[PDB]
Amino acid sequence: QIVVTQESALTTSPGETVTLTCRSSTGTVTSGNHANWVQEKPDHLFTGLIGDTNNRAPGVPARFSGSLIGDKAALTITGAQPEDEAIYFCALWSNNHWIFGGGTKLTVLGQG
Amino acid sequence: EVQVQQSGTVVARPGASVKMSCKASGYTFTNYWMHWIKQRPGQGLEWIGAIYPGNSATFYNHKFRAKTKLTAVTSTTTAYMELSSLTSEDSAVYYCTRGGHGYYGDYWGQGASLTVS
Numbered sequence A: 001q002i003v004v005t006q007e008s009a010l011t012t013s014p015g016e017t018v019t020l021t022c023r024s025s026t027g028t029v030t031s032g033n034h035a036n037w038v039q040e041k042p043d044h045l046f047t048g049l050i051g052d053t054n055n056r057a058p059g060v061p062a063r064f065s066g067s068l069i070g071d072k073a074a075l076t077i078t079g080a081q082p083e084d085e086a087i088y089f090c091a092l093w094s095n096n097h098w099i100f101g102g103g104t105k106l107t108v109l110g111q112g
Numbered sequence B: 001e002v003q004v005q006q007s008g009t010v011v012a013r014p015g016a017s018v019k020m021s022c023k024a025s026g027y028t029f030t031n032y033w034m035h036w037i038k039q040r041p042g043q044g045l046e047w048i049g050a051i052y053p054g055n056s057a058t059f060y061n062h063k064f065r066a067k068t069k070l071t072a073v074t075s076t077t078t079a080y081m082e083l084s085s086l087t088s089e090d091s092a093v094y095y096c097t098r099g100g101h102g103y104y105g106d107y108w109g110q111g112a113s114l115t116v117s
């Protein structure tokens, strides 16, 4: 229905803050869209990061936070670590569907 | 504790029907939703639907509604997805994920590959 858009690729350095955004083709993302962020690691390893715009999932590092900034949902990683290199997917609940963005590949410079 | 164990790889022919499953352990099955996500290489991710085992409420993606049936068996804490009318567009990796209010997937299963050939 709506189209969800994210940056295709971003490069950051270790220790920098990086923000990823997620936009709705309707013009704004609201609290009712319950923006979700998940991380895809190599080997189809998916980890849930953020639900309901700003709720960190079980066991997620505190450096990951979600919020609404302006018209968009955002994932901020305060102090990016090499292990944060991954693909991040945003999804929005819209008209009773979860609709996915295309993913942002994040590159970090350097070496029960 | 929390484990979402999926059934294995499936190879099927066009026009057939397949049923995939996810066994949940380490949490109360009736307090969470189970969602099904499709990942096709290149295409990215697509949500198929979700079921709440507590009262059997379902939400389907309108694209998959005719061809998908979602069920759950609470005694065995297992969720099932039946797909019919298989085409090559259905070849993808399918994931079970655990959801709740405001989220679809805090814990993900390992993925089950379906090849239609």
Ligand SMILES: CO[C@H]1O[C@H](CO)[C@@H](O)[C@H](O[C@H]2O[C@H](C)[C@H](O)C[C@H]2O)[C@@H]1O[C@H]1O[C@H](CO)[C@H](O)[C@H](O)[C@H]1O
Residues within 6 Å of the ligand: A034, A093, A096, B033, B050, B057, B059, B099, B100, B101, B102, B103, B104
């Ligand atoms: C019965 O389920 C609906 O209501 C509960 C309680 O408010 C929500 O937690 C449900 O939403 C979650 O589950 C769906 C499958 C998505 O993953 C989004 C999650 O938050 C669900 O809410 C939907 O249905 C109600 C009507 O009952 C409204 O349409 C609401 O906008 C939907 O989110």
